[PDB]
Design a protein around this ligand. Structure first.
Ligand SMILES: Nc1ncnc2c1ncn2[C@H]1C[C@H](O)[C@@H](COP(=O)(O)OP(=O)(O)OP(=O)(O)O)O1
Ligand SMILES: [Ca+2]
Ligand SMILES: [Ca+2]
Length: 341
DNA sequence: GAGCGATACCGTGA
DNA sequence: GATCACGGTATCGCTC
């Protein structure tokens, strides 16, 4: 088909800009402060101005305070970013009935029925870029290509504020010339098992025994990467359905004292039942991050919806079950509700 | 041998 | 010093 990918530029930071235009140009850094000491947390994202000296998503707010003592450091209002995403999403529904809202920030259109080629597609790309900018003053990148994977990759080259097609000739080029670490879904641990195998391009994955791939990365990515290289990949745009919802919070001190921890855990459950709104989970899992940073979870499915009072009682039993089965101290604790009715 | 639920793992910031 | 949120998958024991 023809997929159009849209991805909002430096999204949290851009929305901050738009809600107070004085920040434009100045370096802006949206943070997740965790409240264990001064500026304890992580950098959610940062406009490109600030991104120039080292301050990217995921690194600590202290290491970020080093590189730019003088930047503007805002707290993250995810609820705000959501509300304005929702709208941009709604604007994109007037350009195709077939839409995959992939995240708060990304969405794919199956526009094969709305145009006939890549130049007509592309000129849509501008129609849409121009619409979002007029209606909401956000700028976005657009990736156009024959499937969802290569349309994400078109965009991840052209950003920031860009647009790029990948005609079938260019696709042929990249299965050969593109590095496998720049494939959607190939992160660090796997790019390594692939260097450790001589595969450094997609096309390289065809001329190897398939169980050799299967053995290393699993039948899933094996079959994923192969189809991509045989150009036989083709996955349809489909609306996603939230399958889980939860909240993990951080504790001012570590601990394995059940009564010190309970307050944090009941808080994760209120923030969770508010996010749930009208949805009735049948499954609950308690989730401890250890002080080692490994992640542990205990769970229980019921044959019926979970009242909050239930969530409270089961949550505390699932926690005790975690304290017996593991001795480490716990740093962060939260819950996660799934299997909605 | 495979189906199914619990849990851990990886990814991606989809 | 390491947030938070979440989907999709592999692995492990029970089970038929
Ligand atoms: N480690 C992270 N932790 C928390 N939030 C993140 C993280 N990474 C990305 N995000 C959030 C904030 C982003 O504005 C938003 C979109 O992710 P992504 O599109 O890759 O980042 P971005 O919009 O800031 O940069 P880009 O311009 O490359 O798209 O998701
Ligand atoms: Ca993105
Ligand atoms: Ca983005």
């Amino acid at each position: 088909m023809i997929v159009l990918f849209v991805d909002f530029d430096y999204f949290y930071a851009q929305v901050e800009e738009v809600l107070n235009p004085s920040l434009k140009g100045k370096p802006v850094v949206v943070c997740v402060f965790s409240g264990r000491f001064e500026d304890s947390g992580a950098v959610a994202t940062a406009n490109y101005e600030a991104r120039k000296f080292g301050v990217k998503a995921g690194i600590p707010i202290v290491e970020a305070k080093k590189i730019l003592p003088n930047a503007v450091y805002l707290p993250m209002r995810k609820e705000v970013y959501q509300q304005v995403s929702s709208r941009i999403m709604n604007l994109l529904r007037e350009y195709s009935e077939k839409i995959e809202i992939a995240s708060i920030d990304e969405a794919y259109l199956d526009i094969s029925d709305k145009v006939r080629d890549y130049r007509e597609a592309y000129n849509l790309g501008l129609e849409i870029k121009n619409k979002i900018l007029e209606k909401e003053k956000i700028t976005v990148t657009v990736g156009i290509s024959k499937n969802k994977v290569f349309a994400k990759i078109a965009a991840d080259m052209a950003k920031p504020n860009g647009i790029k097609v990948i005609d079938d000739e260019e696709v042929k080029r990249l299965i050969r010339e593109l590095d496998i670490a720049d494939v959607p879904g190939i992160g660090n641990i796997t790019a390594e098992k692939l260097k450790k195998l001589g595969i450094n391009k997609l096309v390289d994955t065809l001329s190897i025994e398939f169980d050799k791939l299967k053995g290393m990365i699993g039948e899933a990515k094996a079959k994923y990467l192969i189809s991509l290289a045989r150009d036989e990949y083709n996955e349809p745009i489909r609306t996603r359905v939230r399958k889980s919802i939860g909240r993990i919070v951080t504790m001012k001190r570590n601990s394995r004292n059940l009564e010190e921890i309970k307050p944090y855990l009941f808080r994760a459950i209120e923030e969770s039942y508010y996010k749930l709104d009208k949805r009735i989970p049948k499954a609950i899992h308690v989730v401890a991050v250890t002080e080692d940073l490994d992640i542990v979870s205990r769970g229980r499915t019921f044959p019926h919806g979970i009242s909050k009072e239930t969530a409270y009682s089961e949550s505390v039993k699932l926690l005790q079950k975690i304290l017996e089965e593991d001795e480490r101290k716990i740093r962060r604790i939260g819950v996660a509700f799934s299997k909605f009715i």
